[PDB]
Amino acid sequence: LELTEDMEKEISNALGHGPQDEILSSAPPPPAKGGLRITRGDIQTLKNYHWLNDEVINFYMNLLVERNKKQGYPALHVFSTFFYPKLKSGGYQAVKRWTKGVNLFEQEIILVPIHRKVHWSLVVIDLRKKCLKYLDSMGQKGHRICEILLQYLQDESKTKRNSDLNLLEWTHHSMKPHEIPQQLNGSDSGMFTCKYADYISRDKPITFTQHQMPLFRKKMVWEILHQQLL
């Protein structure tokens, strides 16, 4: 996508000077019960070379849920970026309510965004094929993260459905060496996580490269303002 002059303009306005706390997009918008928000300060973490913060990540993951529904793409559940550290630190009981009113096992793909010491990565849980994969643009392994996530699934299933998983029919993958790393910039780690999640959620092979990130950051500022993926 080469961008419109007006697109460019609105993107430059959203990233330029003004009140850091000014709310630029909310999903669902006023009046709705809370309510993801993006302020000017958060949307500035999309300036090139800046690291994305949790508010950008969660807002974008959520646009993927809406988009998947509108396009006939697979049923997508995305967890908060706060879900995994809370589960790692405090166990199933601490997060059991974070799926209230949802039957996780009637979805098809689950995305778990993972913030690690200094970078973003992603776990995809593919319910159709009983598979978990850890995608990390700095090439780290996450078979530990995955096993914690699989345990959570058995714990959800036993609690919410009173049934057990057979964890033997379930399998971990970490990517092979050339399935898209870039360790040169953990600045772009959050963009990789969001694009990984965008393609994975559509069953689309992951073919973009590092060269596209600056354009993807500008596109994502417009997507967030307009709550619509391009």
Next chain:
Amino acid sequence: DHINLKVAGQDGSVVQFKIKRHTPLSKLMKAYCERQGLSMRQIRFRFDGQPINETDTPAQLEMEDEDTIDVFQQQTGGVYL
């Protein structure tokens, strides 16, 4: 109709609150940062994983008495200069 709510920090601490079910949660949030010496912009309040906004009310988010709110620090890798 006051409701008690628990606010749980990541350092394990727990600050209790009694508050009107139709008062905006911002009153709660500000008291919390001031008390903990925290910066509002650096922290997130969540109710079972979902955003609570200053403008939100407990009734509007259908909290019940005794419920727990989490506070998390922002997650950001780095600082560009």
